[PDB]
Structures are given as structure tokens and as C-alpha cells.
């Protein structure tokens, strides 16, 4: 689970919010993207190096006007792992109040297979993106 999509038309009719976190860094950009049917991110598997590598970034195809753009600092995260059960939990809360896109986050270690962790955890704010756009529907972005 890497990123999300936010917008109201998603076909270059209006503006949309792009939030992607791939193997290099987090990118936050607002353009008039042309989202295809099934946008995702592709990662090669076992290329005789005993490791993984991302090679596909099929999310959009064009951008006429961009009002916001942000690129975080680059980092190195692993793209491998094979466990019999889930190990990490990612909780997020997104709200669009008066153009402010509040983003909350919290991480906690879990040990479950196919159930939601029953418990309690507080959520802290992380960033406030003044996108000022009209959001109606969203879509997540998974890894291949």
C-alpha cells in the first residue's frame, strides 16, 4: 500500500490530487491528470539479484496545468518480504475542510492474518495540504 488518488472527475476535466510514495520518496502534486482504467505501480521480482525493483509507474499520462507540487527527500525502503501473517498496521484519516486537506497517521506493530486489530490507538496530524480542490471520489494505489 503506497499512495492514493483524490479528485472529482479523474479524466482531465478538473483538478485532482496525486499522492504517491514509491521506493524513492513521497510525491504530492495537483494537476489535471488523465487517470487510466487500472493505474498501479509495477515492481520486478527476483531479477537474478535476490531482490526487487520498481519499473512501472502507470498512474497518469498527461498534465495540462499544475497548481501544487511537492517532492519529499529521497530515501531507500525495502521492496521484499514474505511472512505468513501481517506485521504492520497503517491508519490514516483524510478530511477536506475549507480547502485544508488534513492528513493523520499512526503506525503500530500487529500480529494478525485476516482480521482487523481489535484495540485502541491515537492518530496524530502530519501535514496540511492547501489543495483547495473539490474532491468527490478517491482510489488507492497498490503494488504489483
Amino acid at each position: 500500500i503506497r499512495g492514493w488518488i483524490f479528485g472529482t472527475t479523474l479524466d482531465s476535466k478538473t483538478q485532482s490530487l496525486l499522492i504517491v510514495n514509491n521506493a524513492t520518496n513521497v510525491v504530492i502534486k495537483v494537476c489535471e491528470f488523465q487517470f487510466c482504467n487500472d493505474p498501479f505501480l509495477g515492481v520486478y521480482y527476483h531479477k537474478n539479484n535476490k531482490s526487487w525493483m520498481e519499473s512501472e509507474f502507470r498512474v497518469y499520462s498527461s498534465a495540462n496545468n499544475c497548481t501544487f507540487e511537492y517532492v519529499s527527500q529521497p530515501f531507500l525502503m525495502d521492496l521484499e518480504g514474505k511472512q505468513g501473517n501481517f506485521k504492520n498496521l497503517r491508519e490514516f484519516v483524510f478530511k477536506n475542510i475549507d480547502g485544508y486537506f488534513k492528513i493523520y497517521s499512526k503506525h503500530t506493530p500487529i500480529n494478525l492474518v485476516r482480521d482487523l486489530p481489535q484495540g485502541f490507538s491515537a492518530l496524530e496530524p502530519l501535514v496540511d495540504l492547501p489543495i483547495g480542490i473539490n474532491i468527490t471520489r478517491f482510489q488507492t494505489l497498490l503494488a504489483l
Binding site: 476535466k13 478538473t14 483538478q15 475549507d98 480547502g99 492547501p130 483547495g132 473539490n134
Partner: protein, 50 residues
């Protein structure tokens, strides 16, 4: 004539505060919808100041 500045004149509903809309679609003033770039009872959403 400085017509470089445009303003929106037709809309279906009032937008929320602190919201920016760059929609350039032809507005439908009549009961019948509009298509293409022009038409009867259709108007351009932007207009230039004098």
C-alpha cells in the same frame, strides 16, 4: 484593450470558500443541454474586462 484577465460568469452552484475552479466547459443556460463549443442558449463561462 486589456482582455488578458478573465472572470467566471456562469455556474451551476456557488463554490466553497478557498476553492479554485478552472472549468472551461460551456454552461447550459436553458433546459436543453449544450454540446460542442457553441449552441443556442449557451454562453462561455469566462468574460474579459474592459
Amino acid at each position: 484593450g486589456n482582455y488578458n484577465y478573465l472572470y467566471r460568469l456562469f455556474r451551476k452552484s456557488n463554490l466553497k470558500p478557498f476553492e479554485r475552479d478552472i472549468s472551461t466547459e460551456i454552461y447550459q443556460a436553458g433546459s436543453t443541454p449544450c454540446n460542442g463549443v457553441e449552441g443556442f442558449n449557451c454562453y462561455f463561462p469566462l468574460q474579459s474586462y474592459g
